[PDB]
C-alpha cells in the first residue's frame with residue numbers, strides 16, 4: 001500500500017486501552033488510600049505495648065525460680081528443719 | 086525484565102573493575118576474577134532478594150502480633 005494507511009493503524013496499535021487505564025487509575029487510588037489508612041493506624045502504636053511484662057518472654061523468672069528454690073542458699077529457714085520426716 | 090542476575094553480575098563486574106582502577110591498573114587485568122566477581126554478584130543479589138522476601142513476611146507477622154497485642158487494651 002502507501003505510507004499513511006499503515007502508519008495510521010501502527011499508531012493505533014502503539015496507543016493503549018483507555019478503559020484499562022481508567023480502571024487501573026481508580027483501582028490504584030482505592031488501594032493506595034486503604035494502605036495509607038493502614039500506615040496511619042500503624043504509626044499510632046506506642047513504643048511500649050500495653051501487655052509488655054505480661055508477655056511470656058518478659059518474665060523469665062516465674063518459671064525459673066520454682067526449680068531453684070530447693071538449692072542451698074535460697075531455702076526458707078523452715079524447710080530443712082522438718083524435711084527429715 | 087531484569088531478573089536480579091543481570092543486575093548482580095553487572096554490579097560484580099563493575100566493582101571488580103572499580104577496585105582494579107583504584108590501584109591504577111588496566112581495567113581487565115585479571116578477567117578470571119572478573120568472572121568470579123560476576124558470579125559473586127549474581128549470588129549475592131539472589132540471596133538479597135530471597136532474604137528480603139523472608140524478612141518482609143516475618144515483619145508482617147511481627148506487625149500482626151503487635152497490633153493484636155495493642156488491640157487488647159480496648160477489649
Ligand SMILES: CCCCCCCCCCC(CCCCCCCCCC)(CO[C@H]1O[C@@H](CO)[C@H](O[C@@H]2O[C@@H](CO)[C@H](O)[C@@H](O)[C@@H]2O)[C@@H](O)[C@@H]1O)CO[C@H]1O[C@@H](CO)[C@H](O[C@@H]2O[C@@H](CO)[C@H](O)[C@@H](O)[C@@H]2O)[C@@H](O)[C@H]1O
Nearest residue numbers: 087088089092093096126129130133134135137138141142
Ligand atoms: C543495590 C542497587 C539496586 C539497583 C537495582 C534496582 C532495580 C529494581 C529491581 C530490583 C530487584 C532485585 C534487587 C537487586 C539488588 C541489587 C543487588 C545488591 C547487591 C549486589 C551484589 C527486586 O525488585 C522486585 O523484588 C521483589 C521481591 O519480592 C519486590 O516485590 C515486592 O516483594 C514483596 C515483599 O515480600 C512485596 O510484599 C510485594 O509488594 C512485591 O511483590 C520488589 O523489591 C520488586 O518488585 C529485581 O527483581 C528481582 O526480584 C524477584 C522479583 O520477582 C525475582 O525473583 C523472584 O524470586 C522468587 C521470590 O522468592 C519469586 O517466587 C520468583 O517469582 C521471582 O523469580 C527476580 O527475577 C527479579 O525480578
Ligand SMILES: CCCCCCCCCCCCCCCCCCCC(=O)O[C@H](COC(=O)CCCCCCCCCCCCCC)COP(=O)(O)OCCN
Nearest residue numbers: 093096097098100101104118119121122123125126127129
Ligand atoms: C552493596 C551493593 C554494591 C556492592 C556489590 C558487591 C558485589 C559482590 C562483591 C563482588 C566482589 C568481586 C571481587 C572479585 C574477586 C576478587 C577476589 C580476590 C581475592 C584475593 O585475591 O585474595 C587476597 C585479596 O584480599 C581480599 O580480597 C580479601 C579482603 C576483601 C575484604 C572484604 C571484607 C569483607 C568483610 C566486611 C564486609 C563489609 C562490611 C561493611 C559493614 C590476596 O590479594 P592479592 O593476591 O592481590 O595480593 C595481596 C594484597 N594484600
